[PDB]
Scaffold this active site. Structure first.
Site, short mmCIF file in Angstrom:
data_model
loop_
_atom_site.label_atom_id
_atom_site.label_comp_id
_atom_site.label_asym_id
_atom_site.label_seq_id
_atom_site.Cartn_x
_atom_site.Cartn_y
_atom_site.Cartn_z
CG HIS B 41 -0.56 0.21 2.49
ND1 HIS B 41 -0.12 1.44 2.97
CD2 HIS B 41 -0.57 -0.67 3.53
CE1 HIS B 41 0.17 1.25 4.24
NE2 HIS B 41 -0.09 0.00 4.63
N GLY B 143 2.24 6.14 10.23
CA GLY B 143 3.66 6.04 9.89
C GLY B 143 4.33 4.76 10.40
CB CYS B 145 2.40 1.03 7.47
SG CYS B 145 0.72 1.51 7.90
C1 LIG Z 1 -7.12 4.52 10.95
N1 LIG Z 1 -6.61 4.64 9.60
C2 LIG Z 1 -6.48 5.81 8.98
O1 LIG Z 1 -6.79 6.87 9.51
C3 LIG Z 1 -5.89 5.79 7.58
N2 LIG Z 1 -5.34 4.50 7.18
C4 LIG Z 1 -6.17 3.80 6.18
C5 LIG Z 1 -5.57 2.47 5.77
C6 LIG Z 1 -6.38 1.51 5.16
C7 LIG Z 1 -5.86 0.28 4.79
C8 LIG Z 1 -4.53 0.02 5.00
CL1 LIG Z 1 -3.86 -1.51 4.48
C9 LIG Z 1 -3.70 0.95 5.59
C10 LIG Z 1 -4.22 2.18 6.01
C11 LIG Z 1 -3.36 3.14 6.80
C12 LIG Z 1 -3.37 2.68 8.26
O2 LIG Z 1 -4.31 2.04 8.74
N3 LIG Z 1 -2.30 3.07 8.99
C13 LIG Z 1 -2.07 2.87 10.37
C14 LIG Z 1 -1.45 1.75 10.91
N4 LIG Z 1 -1.27 1.52 12.22
C15 LIG Z 1 -1.74 2.43 13.07
C16 LIG Z 1 -2.40 3.62 12.68
C17 LIG Z 1 -2.92 4.55 13.61
C18 LIG Z 1 -3.55 5.67 13.15
CL2 LIG Z 1 -4.27 6.76 14.29
C19 LIG Z 1 -3.67 5.95 11.79
C20 LIG Z 1 -3.19 5.06 10.88
C21 LIG Z 1 -2.56 3.86 11.28
C22 LIG Z 1 -3.95 4.55 6.74
#
Ligand SMILES: CNC(=O)CN1Cc2ccc(Cl)cc2[C@H](C(=O)Nc2cncc3cc(Cl)ccc23)C1
Ligand SMILES: [Cl-]
Lengths: 291, 300
Positions: B41, B143, B145
């Site tokens: 991604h 960040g 990931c």
């Molecule tokens: C809660 N998610 C978002 O606001 C945006 N997201 C959408 C999304 C969708 C699918 C996939 Cl595979 C990756 C992502 C990204 C995602 O999940 N990264 C994050 C990973 N771990 C902790 C995360 C804590 C936070 Cl607070 C934000 C983002 C994290 C980015």
């Protein structure tokens, strides 16, 4: 999201761990530049170089000098550690937290986070051979060594020294009747963890009430909690501004938790009030600071 | 004495963490030999996440669109390929700090250490378990990931997890190092939702044996149980079924303490019925399930 007991990355410290053997005793040493630091009990302590066997990985280091500084033995070796990180020796205060790299035979086996209790002991996880394992924090690229493990007390808790060999607490390095004093809860740390729960969406314990610092301390004394000072209130300022909950407003929540319990509920997956996260640890884990 | 949630020393993994940038997205990569592994991604925009066609996004990329930074050094990308949900970036330099390693896929109930990273820089290490619902209760921010999960038994690092996303309940989902997700999750912004989670029964039993080893027996009773009756009661508390495999795995801890697995199961049944009555077990007021039988034998 999430809230874990997090340790600093241990790599910079792993490159300093060595095995020290003197006679039949074997324990861990910290190799920084051309000196190996280890508990003096490896040997009336004041009463030769080749008697000390130092092993760094599969390499035998040669001891060319030795001296004592309080309860730490300093072994001058002929090779400087090429993996020596930027470091400082720092003495911490009760309530402050640090990472511990538990070692056996100069080989690191695990890392965990813990706090210096108000009674100067640490609730660690150590077996025979762990002596000389070290406690540390990392600030930017510099390792601040704050603890060296020396012994286990009859209650299963641990005692040790700073890296200058001064014990934390009224302990001595020898076999005699020794015990930990009555411990107390680190109030400023519990408040920091309640702010961490609010940042993570856990707010059921918040209320409309406030309290004076004096009335709160009359309550803290009753429940074996450490007194909260104006310094602790000042240190909680940033977390109070981030959540919009005044420190004395959060003290009223804690007072109700102490007088009434959790009523079958948990805070950050815990049924007890957690005191091993400082205000700085909460800010760091909810901001992403790297090393 | 003592019992802590203990992580493996992270040094061997710290020497593999790099920063990967593709356009405006920046995340972490694992640099092993001449390959950098990271979540696919990284090639997506936020809009792309609703219904991404990764094959279509990837075909429009060349090697120089991927920026890889190892410390203060820019690595040069000389090839790229996709393997399931992982992007593999062939680089011009082999990592001199590459440890002895294996890629292993773990099962629910297994524990591992996580080195949480931001911008290719490690910030912290913690221990956790693969939940029965295939999620992990981690501590991650935007960040993170590409942060990885691992075990180090002897001097070999076994990489078992790469972080991909956070679910609406604040829990985390990811893949093994071959890009196969754990659980029914997709690297797409879709409903999905974690399934109802359960307690890892074999791990709680292991932790009760750890309390016995460390000197505490207040919770034991004079009863035993059949495996079937234990499972009927335990399922009512949202505990995972205990299998004959789990009973076999608890054999060494049973012989060390002299307490049969089904006698420890009877004590667990009674603890679920009664609660702790103001008491703690290894400094905890809840029944702990993130220590395996292997972790207990290792630490105690
Ligand atoms: C809660 N998610 C978002 O606001 C945006 N997201 C959408 C999304 C969708 C699918 C996939 Cl595979 C990756 C992502 C990204 C995602 O999940 N990264 C994050 C990973 N771990 C902790 C995360 C804590 C936070 Cl607070 C934000 C983002 C994290 C980015
Ligand atoms: Cl497994």
């Amino acid at each position: 999201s999430g809230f874990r007991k997090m340790a600093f990355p241990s790599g910079k410290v792993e490159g300093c761990m060595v095995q020290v053997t003197c006679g039949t005793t074997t324990l861990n040493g910290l190799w920084l530049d051309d000196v190996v630091y280890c508990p003096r009990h490896v040997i009336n302590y004041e009463d030769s170089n080749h008697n000390f066997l130092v092993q760094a990985g599969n390499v035998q280091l040669r001891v060319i000098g030795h001296s004592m500084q309080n309860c730490v033995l300093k072994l001058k070796v002929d090779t400087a550690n090429p993996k020596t990180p930027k470091y400082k020796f720092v003495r911490i205060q009760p309530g402050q937290t640090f990472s511990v790299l538990a070692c056996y035979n100069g080989s690191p086996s695990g890392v965990y986070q813990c706090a210096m209790r108000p009674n100067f002991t640490i609730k660690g996880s150590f077996l025979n051979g762990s002596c000389g394992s070290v406690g540390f924090n990392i600030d930017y690229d510099c390792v601040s060594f704050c603890y060296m493990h020396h012994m286990e007390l009859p209650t299963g808790v641990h005692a040790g020294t700073d890296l200058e060999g001064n014990f934390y607490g009224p302990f001595v390095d020898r076999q005699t009747a020794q015990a930990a004093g009555t411990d107390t809860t680190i109030t400023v740390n519990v408040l920091a963890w309640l702010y961490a729960a609010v940042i993570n969406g856990d707010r059921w314990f918040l209320n409309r009430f406030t309290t004076t610092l004096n009335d709160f301390n009359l309550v803290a004394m009753k429940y074996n909690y450490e007194p909260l000072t104006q310094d602790h209130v000042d240190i909680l300022g940033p977390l109070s501004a981030q959540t919009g909950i005044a420190v004395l407003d959060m003290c009223a929540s804690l007072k109700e938790l102490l007088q009434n319990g959790m009523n079958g509920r948990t805070i950050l997956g815990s049924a007890l009030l957690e005191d091993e996260f400082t205000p700085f640890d909460v800010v760091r884990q909810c901001s992403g600071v790297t090393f």
